């Protein structure tokens, strides 16, 4: 689809069998979800945002369906204010900016 | 133009006739620039995201050009780690997400 930006670009994702709402975020290197359980091994990581740094859990090679498009990649879990699909997975689903 | 998301979508902007690089950020409601001593009246504001909040100065009806496309609106200034173009200006230049 083509998504304009008068509102937040929120879409439905499916991850670990569950549905969530997430923001398509070209300002994020990485994908970061609010605290949730995911299967498999994880590693502690830190990431930075507008307000400073936070601790997250890094899960590799996690399948996620984003607005109907399949991706499999790294998902960070932690105290983000909103679920965030970042560039790592935006590229997988063929997303570009256009003006 | 079309901007792919393999790398941070950093583009050239012009503010006060002077050039800066800035991040096209569909995950930002508002536009925030790295500390610079811009003239004019401003109001204090707090903006937040990952990591918490930072204090910024809110300037109104500031002309900005983004990759050659003219815009005018509210520009925030403060200790962001990178210049950020948010949706308030991305909508003015007709920027869309496409996949």
């Amino acid at each position: 689809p083509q998504i304009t930006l008068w509102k937040r670009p929120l879409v439905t994702i499916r991850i670990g069998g569950q549905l969530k709402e997430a923001l398509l975020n070209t300002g994020a290197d990485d994908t970061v979800l609010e605290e949730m359980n995911l299967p498999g091994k994880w590693k502690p990581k830190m990431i930075g945002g507008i307000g400073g740094f936070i601790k997250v859990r890094q899960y590799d090679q996690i399948p996620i369906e984003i607005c109907g498009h399949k991706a499999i990649g790294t998902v960070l879990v932690g105290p983000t204010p909103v679920n965030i699909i970042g560039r790592n997975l935006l590229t997988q689903i063929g997303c570009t900016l256009n003006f | 133009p079309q901007i792919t998301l393999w790398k941070r979508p950093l583009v050239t902007i012009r503010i006060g006739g002077q050039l800066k690089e800035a991040l096209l950020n569909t995950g930002a409601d508002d536009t925030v620039l790295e500390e610079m001593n811009l003239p004019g009246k401003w109001k204090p504001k707090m903006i937040g995201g990952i990591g918490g909040f930072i204090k910024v100065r809110q300037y109104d009806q500031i002309p900005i050009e983004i990759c050659g496309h003219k815009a005018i609106g509210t520009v925030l200034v403060g200790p962001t780690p990178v210049n950020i173009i948010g949706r308030n200006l991305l909508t003015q230049i007709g920027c869309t997400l496409n996949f």
Partner: peptide
């Protein structure tokens, strides 16, 4: 409300 979701790897 929090509205700027910049995110950077460390």
């Amino acid at each position: 409300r929090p509205g700027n979701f910049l995110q950077n790897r460390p």
